[PDB]
Design a protein around this ligand. Structure first.
Ligand SMILES: *[C@@H]1O[C@H](CO)[C@@H](O[C@@H]2O[C@H](CO)[C@@H](O)[C@H](O)[C@H]2NC(C)=O)[C@H](O)[C@H]1NC(C)=O
Ligand SMILES: *[C@@H]1O[C@H](CO)[C@@H](O[C@@H]2O[C@H](CO)[C@@H](O)[C@H](O)[C@H]2NC(C)=O)[C@H](O)[C@H]1NC(C)=O
Ligand SMILES: *[C@@H]1O[C@H](CO)[C@@H](O[C@@H]2O[C@H](CO)[C@@H](O)[C@H](O)[C@H]2NC(C)=O)[C@H](O)[C@H]1NC(C)=O
Ligand SMILES: *[C@@H]1O[C@H](CO)[C@@H](O[C@@H]2O[C@H](CO)[C@@H](O)[C@H](O)[C@H]2NC(C)=O)[C@H](O)[C@H]1NC(C)=O
Lengths: 236, 236, 236, 236
């Protein structure tokens, strides 16, 4: 994240680190012992996840490593957009969710704890926290320590005004109009918590990150509650 | 390109500047009045070309603007790799080639002329030229003037040693082992002229560009002649 | 140093060029007629200094050559780290300081003068200067003329975020987040002048030097005053 | 190694890859199911080894990973020299050997096979093979594929003439007077096989590697046969 700070040790127990083998690629959110939530755009052949991490590059004994048995990308995400080198005006990136079923259940401890799905609808003006090991430079340099930033939930209008892509109902708009604070490359899939509640996850934003006047796009989690639950329950 | 020089004025009438909306994204080679060659990885929905261009930020009346009717990416290029967030070890980027059918044929002036495909196979040691408006810095910054650079054709083992991806017969290894001279981001699709002869196209290379002991990959055009001719002859 | 400029002639009479045989290896600071300060990691068996030097490849008569009688590395610097082939994560490089007793005292001319230790503690935001004949390229190449550069004193969290090693109270974080300006290899031991005041010495930084978002470490001299004075007063 | 070539797949079954956690640091030689041989100068806190590797950065299913239970550096190697930033003239680097006892025996297969200690004394003029994943650039860039080079065994006189360090009886001298072919950074501990027999291991060489007229120093294995065997037998 850009313009953030070092989250407190173990303050974000639900924060996940998604890997493609030995390489960190995204952020995630732990929802249940066998279920992690991330962005549908973190597309790779095999997945591995790290729970309880604070230092991305140092091995902490209280962390937990796990393999992923299967991934369930939302059926609404247009995968075809990924092959494109440039985003076509009017492109719709709605439904940027994906569920990952861990092969071996995770051990809920002091260090690892899931977070509950939201029940209320996001209210603009709200103070939200974003977290991750995404780049700390607007254009790329990852940090060791997990980063945290505070941002404001803004009306979708704000985002739709400045983007060429479609800003839909299943999206959220948040950031700092003054720029300088924003999520960035590889923060994807990470959690967005407002007034202490999980409201959505990091999806896409401006190039460069923190561009003044251009907020970032997050998934509106409330709109997906059914699909998630349905998938969890239907899949052993 | 990195470590090159401003190509002399109008020296390369075959250099194509492939745009998308108002911005340049790739390079290419003029092979006919209504046929342009480029990299399969320069994937976008709509295509536009500029010919007889020298400056990237200047109206040139000698210059010809056009549009592309149909694009034909080589049936071998694994497009799936493009959606992946990270390149897995062993990923084969062979056949990185794509033809672009023009809407309205190009007028052959002294500033806009084609180049023939080779019949002579390449031999290491040879001196080659590459050009484009790719970054002039190793990591980015596009130049106003078209850049040119001289590099040495190396045997494939030089590239294979350092690349985790597969280096094949349909590929060429070129650059300067000492580093400092190479093609960079957005030079893709441009031409590789070895001994006044077109031997291949800019596929990909290391990042940073011009990394010592890490040359770059180019398509071994000679292996695509049959295909190239058929696609023009059979179709449009 | 990277991205600096040739220090004006004789502007830094305190800059010391620490040699070993015929070659320069480190920098240092003149604190007295018979006392030079440098980095504990500039470990060799015999020590030689040159003072009032501007060029590295030129006999300067204003310049004074000497020899070191006894060297006293700070009792805190873990010398063991120096034998290790790779730095383990968490390695603490605190107390990187070493005093050098001269054989024959230095004559104080207008070209060879000491500098006082600070009493004022440093505050972020400050503008600091660093100099030396370290590499002028990010990865090496020593300059003839002494280099100078201006950088900003940053809070320690900026360094800690990106360093796998421990960043402590006895350390300072300085550089330019944008990259391009920094100290490089063989600048170690040289001085850090913040607001016309000596605040610390070049300890270590990233490789490449001047890496964006990765500033460099310097010793927080203020924390070593008691020790520094005792070692001169008690001994030689 | 510099100026070498890609060893044939699995041609050097005794070749070892020594790691400090996830980082490759040296080469080694497999002597027995529980014993690996490397340089005493590969100094780190914990050791791990990879057997049957051909690609250093790609995971091969026929490779073998193992942990090291204890290291036995030759009691004659002067460890104190490691803390030195510059080598003092006349420094003696004799006895650069170290034994590593694997925690779990290795499985001798087609891919992994130990090599026997030498019985005859090295004869000058001999054609020798050196191998490793050390730098491929004289000053650093490691390869994926294991590299092999052919060099000549030369009289010690040749080496003693050009080095400032002591060249002793327990050392060997080898290289190409024409320069260009030599071992390099991180080839350390690797095997040196002459006329099909293990004669010694890589120790130190010129900076840069392959410097014309400056051969490289390897350990004269025959002189250490007793100590090795004694250590193997005496240590469970
Ligand atoms: C084209 O690229 C894709 C992406 O790497 C390859 O697809 C993978 O293939 C393996 C088996 O070979 C599967 O286990 C993975 O799950 C596949 N991933 C996806 C996203 O489908 C594909 O094999 C490549 N094709 C070729 C000919 O190399
Ligand atoms: C997914 O994204 C692609 C690319 O924007 C869409 O494909 C385009 O669809 C329109 C018609 O709706 C065509 O005219 C374009 O030429 C198509 N472009 C390409 C590259 O195929 C696609 O429609 C989007 N949505 C879905 C549901 O597929
Ligand atoms: C190991 O290397 C060190 C450094 O060369 C040797 O220590 C030197 O020993 C001489 C006397 O033989 C002293 O005059 C030097 O001042 C010492 N230098 C240092 C830095 O201690 C040491 O003797 C070498 N050999 C052994 C067996 O220790
Ligand atoms: C000084 O540095 C050395 C090298 O890393 C440290 O020594 C290691 O200490 C651990 C236990 O803390 C042992 O398990 C390792 O085997 C030690 N390695 C060696 C080579 O002795 C030492 O702890 C450091 N000292 C401090 C105070 O940090």
């Amino acid at each position: 994240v850009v313009g953030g700070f070092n989250c407190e040790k173990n303050s974000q127990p639900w924060q996940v680190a998604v890997y493609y083998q030995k390489e960190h690629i995204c952020g995630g959110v732990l929802l249940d012992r066998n279920w992690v939530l991330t962005a549908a755009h973190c597309y790779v052949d095999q997945y591995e996840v790290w729970l309880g991490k604070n230092k991305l590059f140092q091995e902490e004994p209280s962390a937990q490593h796990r393999l992923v048995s299967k991934s369930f990308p939302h059926p609404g995400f247009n995968m075809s957009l990924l092959m494109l080198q440039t985003i076509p005006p009017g492109a719709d990136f709605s439904d940027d969710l994906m569920l990952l079923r861990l092969s071996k259940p995770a051990d809920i401890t002091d260090v690892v704890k899931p977070i509950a799905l939201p029940t209320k609808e996001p209210k603009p003006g709200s103070k939200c926290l974003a977290s991750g090991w995404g780049s700390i430079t607007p254009t790329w340099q990852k940090p060791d320590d997990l980063q945290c930033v505070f941002i404001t939930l803004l009306p979708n209008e704000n985002c739709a005004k400045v983007y060429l892509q479609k800003v839909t109902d299943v999206m959220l708009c948040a950031g700092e109009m003054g720029g300088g604070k924003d999520t960035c490359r590889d923060d994807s899939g990470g959690p967005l918590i407002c007034d202490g509640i999980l409201q959505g996850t990091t999806s896409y934003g401006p190039v460069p990150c923190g561009k003044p006047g251009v907020p970032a796009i997050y998934t509106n989690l409330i709109k997906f509650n059914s699909w998630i639950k349905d998938t969890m329950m239907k899949n052993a």
